[PDB]
Design a protein around this motif. Structure first.
Motif, PDB file in Angstrom:
ATOM      1  N   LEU A   1       3.078   9.895 -10.070  1.00 44.07           N
ATOM      2  CA  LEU A   1       2.390  10.060 -11.331  1.00 44.07           C
ATOM      3  C   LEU A   1       1.480  11.279 -11.285  1.00 44.07           C
ATOM      4  O   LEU A   1       1.389  12.014 -12.258  1.00 44.07           O
ATOM      5  CB  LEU A   1       1.581   8.802 -11.660  1.00 44.07           C
ATOM      6  CG  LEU A   1       2.404   7.551 -12.018  1.00 44.07           C
ATOM      7  CD1 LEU A   1       1.456   6.391 -12.200  1.00 44.07           C
ATOM      8  CD2 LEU A   1       3.163   7.782 -13.335  1.00 44.07           C
ATOM      9  N   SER A   2       0.807  11.502 -10.159  1.00 40.58           N
ATOM     10  CA  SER A   2      -0.085  12.665 -10.038  1.00 40.58           C
ATOM     11  C   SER A   2       0.709  13.967 -10.242  1.00 40.58           C
ATOM     12  O   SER A   2       0.248  14.847 -10.964  1.00 40.58           O
ATOM     13  CB  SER A   2      -0.779  12.693  -8.662  1.00 40.58           C
ATOM     14  OG  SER A   2      -1.596  11.543  -8.498  1.00 40.58           O
TER      15      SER A   2
ATOM     16  N   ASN B   1       0.837  -1.190   0.000  1.00 36.30           N
ATOM     17  CA  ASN B   1       0.000   0.000   0.000  1.00 36.30           C
ATOM     18  C   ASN B   1       0.875   1.244   0.000  1.00 36.30           C
ATOM     19  O   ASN B   1       0.552   2.252  -0.660  1.00 36.30           O
ATOM     20  CB  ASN B   1      -0.931  -0.008   1.216  1.00 36.30           C
ATOM     21  CG  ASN B   1      -1.781   1.237   1.301  1.00 36.30           C
ATOM     22  OD1 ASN B   1      -1.421   2.200   1.976  1.00 36.30           O
ATOM     23  ND2 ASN B   1      -2.903   1.236   0.595  1.00 36.30           N
TER      24      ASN B   1
ATOM     25  N   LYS C   1       3.652   5.690  -5.753  1.00 39.26           N
ATOM     26  CA  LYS C   1       3.544   5.706  -7.216  1.00 39.26           C
ATOM     27  C   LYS C   1       2.436   6.669  -7.665  1.00 39.26           C
ATOM     28  O   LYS C   1       2.611   7.474  -8.597  1.00 39.26           O
ATOM     29  CB  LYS C   1       3.258   4.296  -7.735  1.00 39.26           C
ATOM     30  CG  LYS C   1       3.268   4.184  -9.252  1.00 39.26           C
ATOM     31  CD  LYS C   1       4.626   4.585  -9.803  1.00 39.26           C
ATOM     32  CE  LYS C   1       4.654   4.539 -11.321  1.00 39.26           C
ATOM     33  NZ  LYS C   1       5.990   4.908 -11.865  1.00 39.26           N
ATOM     34  N   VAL C   2       1.295   6.587  -6.995  1.00 37.47           N
ATOM     35  CA  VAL C   2       0.184   7.474  -7.305  1.00 37.47           C
ATOM     36  C   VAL C   2       0.594   8.922  -7.089  1.00 37.47           C
ATOM     37  O   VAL C   2       0.257   9.812  -7.902  1.00 37.47           O
ATOM     38  CB  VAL C   2      -1.030   7.149  -6.420  1.00 37.47           C
ATOM     39  CG1 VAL C   2      -2.057   8.273  -6.473  1.00 37.47           C
ATOM     40  CG2 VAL C   2      -1.641   5.869  -6.889  1.00 37.47           C
TER      41      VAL C   2
ATOM     42  N   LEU D   1       2.332   1.683  -3.557  1.00 37.26           N
ATOM     43  CA  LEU D   1       1.307   2.218  -4.443  1.00 37.26           C
ATOM     44  C   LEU D   1       1.018   3.693  -4.158  1.00 37.26           C
ATOM     45  O   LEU D   1       0.869   4.485  -5.100  1.00 37.26           O
ATOM     46  CB  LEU D   1       0.027   1.378  -4.348  1.00 37.26           C
ATOM     47  CG  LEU D   1       0.161  -0.016  -4.999  1.00 37.26           C
ATOM     48  CD1 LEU D   1      -1.073  -0.880  -4.693  1.00 37.26           C
ATOM     49  CD2 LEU D   1       0.317   0.139  -6.508  1.00 37.26           C
TER      50      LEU D   1
END
Lengths: 65, 67
Positions: free
Chosen positions: B53-54, B43, B49-50, B46
């Motif tokens: 990328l955001s 978690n 990563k989110v 992730l």
DNA sequence: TAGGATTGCGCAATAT
DNA sequence: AATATTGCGCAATCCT
């Protein structure tokens, strides 16, 4: 002497304590199982977000071509 | 009849069964606790990563908008 | 009808 | 003194 009231109240209180202790442990375990289901669902949600973000990035970048 | 040799044998077998079933559930609990640690580290990966990328996407969109 | 698996509880030794 | 924990075991019930 299991006939003495001293013994009886002792058993009565300890039976309450054992059941309470056992209930707490069972609760802690059920929570743990719920945290797994929850984390699993949330990780699925985030992976979907990673995929969506990547698609958005590819689409904008194609605007250069 | 709790003096029956048949009774004592049945009790012995169930006592073995009870310990095995409790062991199995305790192991299952231990495996579940490990899974939480594992799912938690995933978690965190992730989330990172989110966020990355955001920020990357926010920057790119801002470039297009400043045209 | 047989038999193991599951589970809640009681007892008492042991721990806090 | 009192509550909390737990190994061993009884028994009801579930599951094959």
């Amino acid at each position: 002497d299991k006939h003495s009231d001293e013994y009886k109240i002792r058993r009565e209180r300890n039976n309450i304590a054992a059941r309470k202790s056992r209930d707490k442990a069972k609760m802690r375990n059920l929570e743990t199982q719920h945290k797994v289901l929850e984390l699993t669902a949330e990780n699925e949600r985030l992976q979907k977000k990673v995929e969506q973000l990547s698609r958005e990035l590819s689409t904008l970048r194609n605007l250069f071509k």
